Amino acid sequence: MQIFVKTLTGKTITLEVEPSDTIENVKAKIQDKEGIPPDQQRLIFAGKQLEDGRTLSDYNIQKESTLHLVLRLRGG
């Protein structure tokens, strides 16, 4: 199925995925298109930051769902 991701540049890109794909898989597909290292990626959907290890069907992410990609501004 095809899902969307709003990137850092504010543009919406498509990703071809399967319900059983892991968040790590998704982050991987994003690196291919946007070139951002997975370890820097934070995926936000339905108010939740997607957890590595879980899958898309775990978050009921269906076709046409839009994920939101953000990075980090760490501070202490």
Binding site: T9, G35, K48, E64, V70, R72, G76
Partner: protein, 347 residues
């Protein structure tokens, strides 16, 4: 001795990000009350995040000196060294509210968090060459706003709802129609009582694998009308928002410091909360000064600006920011806490 009326939070090492969030949620009065209400009687005071939050909130509300957060980090299951790692405050917010929301499920305060922070959006897709349209409604607990090239929050929302072209490399999958060119546009169905805005102050630079923070100037107002961005507006409840808190990040994401400015009662009377130090400030110090974009400047001033914003809906303000008295705190809680101020005494 000092006059703010409010107390700060002690830094454990690199927990400024946690302290800013805690003040932010502590002054979301309606949520604080809901947390005081959680059933913590039979909870292990070393594993319970809800008991830890209740404790931190109670202290902030009654103490007259900085509040510690060690029991909070302990209930997260962290070891001492974990308090020495810097973190993103919006990330902490997503993870924390989710955790507290789940813990509230099954209780009398169940659903409180979605009620305060969750909204709904509608995504419209349409094929340019084939007559086919498809919608998708999605919840959200905060909005990431595009900053680059945007002068203010209005241009940013205008950009958020702007229709986009699903072109070439990102053509839309219609189904029996295969990959087609289409337009995607997003609108809001609802905006929550408490609105969290994450300012997209980043860009990834391929020639360093690094996130280079965007410190450009970006204006946000004290009063924020958002009816323009709702699919359908309601006369008895315009989406008029009032600025409540400004979460400020200072530095590059190679080390930074978090601070939060709030006007707790939503009355324009601002204070700056920098870890253990709470001080009264002017509106400009909390607002304009955190717009950013002070370049050619060779100082920290250029990299110090708003990252996360908190607005409260005008119509919900008196409820969300309703005064909290001891009357709102369960005897069971007060007593358990005071029995701790004891047990930590005779030992």
């Amino acid at each position: 001795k000092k006059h703010t009326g409010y107390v700060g939070l002690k830094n454990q090492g690199a927990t400024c990000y946690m302290n800013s969030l805690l003040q932010t949620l502590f002054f979301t009065n309606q949520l604080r009350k809901a947390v005081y209400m959680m059933p913590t009687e039979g909870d292990d005071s070393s594993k319970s995040v809800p008991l830890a939050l209740q404790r931190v909130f109670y202290e902030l509300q009654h103490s007259d000196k900085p509040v510690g957060t060690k029991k909070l980090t302990k209930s997260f299951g962290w070891e001492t060294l974990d308090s020495f790692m810097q973190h993103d405050v919006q990330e902490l917010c997503r993870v924390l509210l989710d955790n507290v929301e789940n813990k509230m499920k099954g209780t009398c305060v169940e659903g409180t968090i979605p009620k305060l922070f969750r909204g709904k959006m509608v995504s419209y897709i349409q094929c340019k060459e084939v007559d086919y349209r498809s919608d998708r409604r999605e919840d959200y607990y905060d909005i990431q706003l595009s900053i680059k090239g945007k002068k203010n929050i209005f241009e940013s929302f205008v950009d958020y709802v702007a229709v986009e072209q699903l072109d070439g490399d990102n053509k839309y999958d219609a189904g029996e129609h295969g990959l087609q060119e289409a337009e995607k546009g997003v609108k809001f169905l609802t905006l929550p009582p408490v609105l969290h805005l994450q300012l997209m102050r980043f860009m990834y630079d391929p020639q360093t694998d690094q996130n280079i923070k965007i410190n450009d100037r970006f204006e946000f107002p004290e009063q924020l009308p958002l009816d323009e961005f709702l699919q359908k507006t309601d006369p008895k409840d315009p989406a008029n928002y009032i600025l409540h808190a400004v979460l400020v990040h200072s530095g590059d994401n190679h080390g930074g410091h978090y601070v939060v400015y709030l006007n707790p009662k939503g009355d324009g009377k601002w204070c700056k909360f920098d870890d253990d130090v709470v001080s009264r400030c002017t509106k400009e110090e909390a607002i304009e000064h955190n717009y950013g974009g002070h370049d050619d400047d060779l100082s920290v001033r250029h990299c110090t600006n708003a990252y996360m914003l908190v607005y409260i809906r005008e119509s919900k303000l008196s409820e969300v920011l309703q005064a909290v008295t001891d009357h709102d705190i369960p005897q069971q809680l007060v007593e358990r806490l005071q029995e701790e101020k004891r047990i930590e005494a005779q030992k």
